[PDB]
Design a protein around this nucleic acid. Sequence first.
RNA 1: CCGUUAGUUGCCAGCGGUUCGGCCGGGCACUCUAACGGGACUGCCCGCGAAAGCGGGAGGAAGGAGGGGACGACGUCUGGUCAGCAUGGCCCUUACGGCCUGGGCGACACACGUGCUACAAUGCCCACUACAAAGCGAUGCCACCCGGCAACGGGGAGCUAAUCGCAAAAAGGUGGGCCCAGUUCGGAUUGGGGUCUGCAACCCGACCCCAUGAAGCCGGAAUCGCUAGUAAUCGCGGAUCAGCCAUGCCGC
Lengths: 98, 60, 80, 24, 127, 155, 206, 114
Amino acid sequence: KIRIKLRGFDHKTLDASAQKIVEAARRSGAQVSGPIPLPTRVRRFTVIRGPFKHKDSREHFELRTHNRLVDIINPNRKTIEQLMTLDLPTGVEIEIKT
Amino acid sequence: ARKALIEKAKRTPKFKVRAYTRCVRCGRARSVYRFFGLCRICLRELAHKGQLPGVRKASW
Amino acid sequence: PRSLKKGVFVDDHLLEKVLELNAKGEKRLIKTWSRRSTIVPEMVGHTIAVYNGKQHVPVYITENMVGHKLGEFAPTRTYR
Amino acid sequence: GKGDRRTRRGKIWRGTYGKYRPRK
Amino acid sequence: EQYYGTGRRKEAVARVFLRPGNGKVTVNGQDFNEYFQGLVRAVAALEPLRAVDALGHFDAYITVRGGGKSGQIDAIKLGIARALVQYNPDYRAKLKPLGFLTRDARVVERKKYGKHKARRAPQYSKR
Amino acid sequence: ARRRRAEVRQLQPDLVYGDVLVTAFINKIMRDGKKNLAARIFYDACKIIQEKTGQEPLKVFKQAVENVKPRMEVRSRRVGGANYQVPMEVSPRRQQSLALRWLVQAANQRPERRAAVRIAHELMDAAEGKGGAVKKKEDVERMAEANRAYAHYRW
Amino acid sequence: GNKIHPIGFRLGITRDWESRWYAGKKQYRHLLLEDQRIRGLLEKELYSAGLARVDIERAADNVAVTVHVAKPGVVIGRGGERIRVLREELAKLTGKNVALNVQEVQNPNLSAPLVAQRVAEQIERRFAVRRAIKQAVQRVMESGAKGAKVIVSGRIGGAEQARTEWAAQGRVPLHTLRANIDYGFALARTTYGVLGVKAYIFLGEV
Amino acid sequence: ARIAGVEIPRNKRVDVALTYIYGIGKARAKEALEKTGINPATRVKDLTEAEVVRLREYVENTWKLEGELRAEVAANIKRLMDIGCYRGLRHRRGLPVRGQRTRTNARTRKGPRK
RNA sequence: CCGUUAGUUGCCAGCGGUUCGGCCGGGCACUCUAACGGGACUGCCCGCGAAAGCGGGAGGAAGGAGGGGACGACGUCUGGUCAGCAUGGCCCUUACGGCCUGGGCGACACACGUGCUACAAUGCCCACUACAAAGCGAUGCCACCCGGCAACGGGGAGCUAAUCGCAAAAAGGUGGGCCCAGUUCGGAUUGGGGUCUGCAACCCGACCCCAUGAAGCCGGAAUCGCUAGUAAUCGCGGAUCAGCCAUGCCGC
C-alpha cells in the first residue's frame, strides 16, 4: 500500500501531477486512492509600499502550499510505471512513502 | 552604495553578538526577515515584477 | 559576603582577569567592557574602568555592594 | 488589572502561567 | 422517520438531526439547557420547533461546535428548522415568517491599514 | 441620510417575554455586548417586581413607560438672522427610544448596591409617578414650551 | 504618484512568474538568490543582442533558463560558439548547469520593453525625444497592436529643469485588471542622471 | 486581631487581614492566612488569641513588614546607595528605579509637575 | 444560494463490533473541502414613466451594484523621498573613507503626539464549569513525571507535520470570599523570590516571587472614533526574534 504527497505551488501543477498519477496508475495499483487535497496552507505578508516613513502605503500578498495526497492500494507491481516514469507536470515534486 | 560594510558575511560572530541580519538585494539590514532575506523593498518590489517564485498578490 | 554567587562570576570576560591577577594583588582599573556580569566574591574592593559609553571612568568597588550586574555601577546619561 | 501582574488579570495578560496558572 | 436540518453561520457549526422521538437534545454530548448554561441562549435552538408546535414528540440529536455558544446555538436553531423542511416539505406559511433563510453574513470583517475596528482610525488630539 | 430615511432597524422580541420593548430595554441595560448579564439584571430586577411588589412586571414596565415617555419639547431655529427656541410634538419613535434610555440611566442614578435593585427601584417608581427618570421627563417637558410663543414656528 | 505595478495587475491573468519553480521553507530563498545572481550576470553580459526577458524554470534540480531576445545571430553565435561560453560559464554560479534555452520572438513592435530600451538608448545618442516617443509609439502599436500608450519621465532631454512627456494611439486600459498588456521602462544614461522611461502596448484581451 | 501594627482584620478572612499591614495584602494575606491556619472565608471578628498567638508569634522572627519592613528595605537600599552600584542609581535622584526612560514622564518619583 | 468531482477531515443521515474519544469496520450522500458551472438581464405580477429607472409583491442562498477585498483615471502639491537602490553634478581623501575598546542616539525644569492600565460591584477575589480562529513549530514547537512559593531546571515522548509540538481563548456558567472605604479596586514607584536569549546585560532587557504600596472615586476651555455584526468589549497567533521595554503594526 503506497502513500504519497505532491506539495505544490501552482494550482495546475498539483493537477497535472495527481491527474497523471491517479488515472495512469489506474491500470496498475488498486486503481489509486483519489487525490485527497488538504486544506491548502496559506502564508501572508504585508509591507510598506511607499519606501520610508508611511505607516499606510503598504499592502500584501502571500506564498503557500497546496497539497495533493494521491495514494494507491494493492502494491500490484505494474503500478510503479504508470506514474513513476509516465509523469508530466513541473511545479511540484514526487513525494513517495508507504 | 554602502560598500565598506559588506562584511555582514565574514560572520566572525566573535561572540554571536555581532553577525547581523540583512536584505540580499537592496541591502538594508533594517527589516530583513528570513525566507526572503530582503529589505521590505528590494523584496516586495522585485516580487512585484514576479521573477520571485509562485508567491502571488493578496485578495479577500 | 559576597557569596552569594560563587565563584565570583564575572562573565569570564571580566572573571578571567579578576582571578589570578588577584594574585600579585591589584594595580587598579582594568577598563572593563562586558559589564553584563553579576559582580561577585573577590571582586570586593578594587578598581576597573567602567565604559560609561564614551569614557572609561575609574570605579572602586566595596564589600556589600560588589556582586550585582556590573552595568549599574557606572552611570550613562546627564540631565539637570 | 493586566498590570496587577501577580494574580488573575496579571498573568492573563503577561501570557505567563506559574504561581497563578499551572502550565495546564 | 428522520429529518435533518443544518444551521451554521459566522464560523459556528450547528448540525441538527431530528428523528421521531420526544424532547431530548444531545448537544454533541449533553442536553439543551444543560449545555446552554443559564443561557437565555437555550430557547434559541427550538424556535423552529415552535414553528408548527410540539416540543415533546421528537428525539433531538445534534453535532454542534465551533465558534462558540450563541453562534452554534442559533445555528442549531436554523438547522432544526431545516429538519422541519425535510419532515413537512410544505411548510411556507410557518417556516418562512418566524422562519429562516441562509446563514447571516456579518463576521468581524477585517482590519487593514490600521484602525483595528475597521472604522476605528486613531482619534485626533488638540491643534 | 443623504435623502432616504435609512430605516428604524427592527429587533426580535424578548427571550423571556417575546417582547420588543424587553429586548430594546435589555440592550439599554447591557454593555460590551454582554447580552447575558444584561438580560440577567433585567430579570433579577423583574424578581424585585414580582417579589417586592405583588403586581406584575408587564404592568409595571408598561406604566413606567407611559410615565417617562415625553411629549412636547424644544430645539431652536436659525432661520431669520436668529435661532429661537421652539417646541414640537416629541415624536413617538424617539419618545420611546429615549424616555427609554433616560429611564435606564436615571435608574443607573438610583442608590442600592445592586443593578437589579436600581432597575427595580426606578421602573417601579416610574410606573407610579415618583422619580429621577420620568421627573427629569416632566422637566424637559413643561420646561420646553416656555418658549411657547416660539412654537408656532414649526419644527 | 502611485498606480499599481503593471505586472501585479497581471499575476493570475495575463503574464506570469518568469522564473517558474517551487521550493518551500528553509531553502526557496537562497534558491531564488542564485536566480538573481543569474538573471543579473545574465542580462549583464547579454543585453548585448538586446535580450528581453528571462524565465529560469525549476521542476527539478537543473534550472531551465529560457531567456528571450529576437536577435538570434550574435545570440547563438556564428554556428554556435556563443551558447557555449554561456551555458558553460553557467556552472560558475551554483553548478547545476542548464540547457542554454534561447527563445526569439516575432516582432519588436509588440515588444514594449525592447522598444523602450530602444527610443531610450536613442535619447542616449542625444536627440528629439518627444519626436522619439511620438513615432516610437506610432509604429510600436501600428505594426499591429491594440494601442501604444507611452510616456517618458525626468530631465526632458535637456533643461536645467526636469519634466515629463507622453503620447498614445488606440487603447491601453491599464486599469481593467485583465487587460493583457506589455509594460516596459528604460534606464536613462544622459549625464542628467537617472531620467527613466516607460511604455505600454495593449495586447487586446476580449 | 492586634498584631504588629495593630492590623485588626474586620469582617474579612485572615488573608484580608495582614494585607492591611505594612507591606501586606495581596500575596501577603495568602502566606499569613496559611500559617495562622484560618478559613479565608472568616469575616474576621473573633480571632481567639488561643489561635491568634500561634500565627501572631511565628509572625515575628520571620516576617517584617511591620516595624521591621524598613530594615531589609532601609538597610538593603543603604548599601547600593553607598557603592558605585546601579540598583540604587535610579534612586540617586528622583526618577523610576524599576525602569524606565526618564527625560519625559516620571513624576511618580520626581514629584509634581513643574 | 443550488446540483457537478470526491472522499484518511468530516458522516452516520442506516448498523455491527464500541476499547463507546467516532477506538475498529463500514457507508460518500449529509457538515467538511478544495474545484465546476447555474443563480434578477428592473427579467415577471401591481404603481409611475415617451424613456432610463425608482418605487410595491412573491420566488429564495440572496438583487435592488449580496456584506467584504484589490482598482485610486487628469493634475495639484516643486509635498516625501539625505543613509532604501538607483543618480547628474559637488565636495572628499592619511583621510567627510576601515576596524576595534566604551558612551550614546532610552541625558531631563518643561510641552505637545499616539497607546497602556485606572478610579470598580451590571466589580474585584477564588474554585469548579461550559466552546474558535486565521497563523505558527526541525535541529523547532515542545508530550507527562521528577527539581517546582515562582522564572523556570531535567528526563522525556511527537512530528515529520487537515492525524504530531504551539493552546491554558477570555467575557459567558455555579457557589463561595467581600458590601461600598481609597477598599481585595488601583497596581506607580520603590518592598522580595525566580524564569530566560545573551558572556557580558551598570548604563542599556524580558520574567516569578518577597516587603512597599503613592495618583486616581470617569477628568477644565477643549478635542476624537465610529451606520450593525457595526460601536463597545474579550481573547489566539503573526514577521522583526538566543532576551527585548510589542501597552506598537498585522490577521483572526
